[PDB]
Symmetry: D4
Subunit: 121 residues, 8 copies
């Protein structure tokens, strides 16, 4: 079952980070959420009720990325995956990738971050 619903490159300005200066000025956070969902039912019916509505998922990601500040990307991603898994039983597994394209690191790079994969129980 390799069917998925995805939201790529979501960007939210937030104040997450371990260092107080970054909690102070903030930065853009890029998020990729991929969901394992069997889309064969919606595929035949064309009824939105038989799949996971991506607009709602975005709202969920937004609510966490733009809510209270946390020290780690790991924790934000854990909160996001848990949020999605809890409210959508059709989702079998949630993968969340959060990239800091401009973190507090003296150097030249495209980005740093984390990715976690969590099955829905």
């Amino acid at each position: 079952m390799q069917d998925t619903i995805f939201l790529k490159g979501m960007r939210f300005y937030g104040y997450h980070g371990a260092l107080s200066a970054e909690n102070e000025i903030g930065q853009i956070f890029k998020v990729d959420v991929t969901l394992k969902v069997d889309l064969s039912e919606a595929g035949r019916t064309d009824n939105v009720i038989d799949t996971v509505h991506y607009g709602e998922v975005f709202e969920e990601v937004k609510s966490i990325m733009e809510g209270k500040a946390v020290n780690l990307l790991e924790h934000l991603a854990e909160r996001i995956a848990n949020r999605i898994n809890s409210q959508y039983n059709r989702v079998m597994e949630t993968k969340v990738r959060i990239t800091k394209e401009n973190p507090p690191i003296p150097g030249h790079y495209d980005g740093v971050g984390i990715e976690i994969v969590r099955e829905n129980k």
Copy 2:
């Protein structure tokens, strides 16, 4: 057997979507189709008849992405995969990814979408 024929970043303007406003103005839809096909025969013969002609596949994708409007990306992708699997027995599995780079979602992101994988029976 990890041989494939691919069509990346196809873009079609369409009126698909669950919300009537988007069925009204439309938007660009980006499609990636990857096909599992054993290319060792064509690889030795150099005869187009022994592989799946990518131009034809494109025509198939186009016909669906630019035809009648549907509510979900899941359904468009299901129609595409089924179309390709039905007409090309050499295709062992069809993966279709459809991305909405600018869907009806208030925010900043690179894209949202779905991907399904369907073996040809």
Copy 3:
């Protein structure tokens, strides 16, 4: 063993294609070659003789992509993989991806193509 030597986005102007008009004007062909090679020996010795020299591989890819014209990307990729596998015993598997970013297809897309994976016997 997930060690690799890679050459990404190689571009050669060539006259390959099934339709005579394209054999006539040509186009750019983008090639990605990934090689499964155990790099632990070179990793400790730092001697180029214990790994596969990427410059040589490029020469091999170039010689095929810029040589005689063929009808299919499948056949070019098969010739490339076979070339690399034959001359480099350290290579355990050769993956070749060839993309036509601007093929003879009326539409909007980022690219179409094929990818094959061939183990060295």
Copy 4:
């Protein structure tokens, strides 16, 4: 366990290479480091002490990419993976990808390079 901490597109100017001319003028080296780390502990605690701090990892990559010159990308990557595995027991596997976007190769391409994956024992 598909949880990861990543650092994408790090870029360092260095003098690594087999040919003396390139050891002489140098070039930019792009590095991607992906780490297999269980982030469920940090995910619940929000304490940086329970995950691998990405800033430190960067420092490690930097120290190698910008230190003494070596002939092969394989060797730089082997040194990086070994460095990370040695100092971070929470890391279960280190993947390092080093790309030379502008190596000593007469042609047109996006990049050439290597990728290795090393589990921490």
Copy 5:
């Protein structure tokens, strides 16, 4: 008066070109149209009737880029500028840039093309 209405990167698949092979397979044509129009009236009134509607302009560009085939980009651009100048008296000057990103030229480049500027009399 440095006010403008612009349409950047329009892309149309067409069969324009001096060589019969290219009139045969076609290619994508990228068009940039910039219009010198005093926008102070619309700027205060917020009524679409006091400015040049960009949607209509696009229709005009489309009609030419996707209509009958011509040998030169110069001629397509001349037809476009004349079309816009004739139907929109508010337009004081029309600049049209047409780029062939993949013309019949053996080599490596981002694009070739022409740009003309025509005042409306």
Copy 6:
């Protein structure tokens, strides 16, 4: 006097547009604001009080792009330029460019929009 302070590629999700469907779903608006300001005073003193603070300008652009909906880009740009000219006497001329990368237009293009230049009296 060719000194400038600039803010490139600002992006705001808004509901501006002449067609009610677009006022309904919205889209991203990209804004470039360039300001003619003599920076020789700040250049020698290094005191923020002698130049125009770019953070404040952004706040001004944001307030308009994210406030009440209007039919035309011309009007949004006129409001922005007037806002900046009114509150910053050091600004000699304000140029505002607003691009709709995904407007209600059936086709393939990079963007459409307007640019106005307004001197401060």
Copy 7:
């Protein structure tokens, strides 16, 4: 007279440079050539004989960028502009921009280079 014929982002691998190491390994050179040519004649006639054929210009640029090695970009650009001005009387002014995206400079940047503008006498 703001009409132009352009060739953007041409790329040639060459061995130009003041330092012997770079004359030894080479690098990619990106060239932009813009030509001031009145296109109103070709614009009405649609005959290639009344404009400057861009394919030929490319051949000229290629012949210099890929011929004998020189120390400076200034000199390559001077040779190119002079070549174009000499053979095409319809060309009123030739602008040549040559960029070294990866020159012998320890640092992070997108490119360095020169641009010259030469009227045809």
Copy 8:
């Protein structure tokens, strides 16, 4: 005299900024330096001594962008232009553009910055 020597997209990590938090963590600064220099002498002689060596200019830009911290981009740019004008009499005018792609601004944008043009007396 529209001849120029340019250095585009130089990137340096620095601690410049008016707010103490940003002086603390830093960020990447992108710099474009364009120089008005008559290149006809070097164009005929091919001797580096008759033009301005771009490598040296880079060293100058680097020394300022990576040296002592200042509050404003205006001041950094003023120091750079003055540095270049003082040491290179062949330079008739220096244009410096400094972009902060990720400044302390809550929002979505590509960049903010300043550009100054200074003739050499």
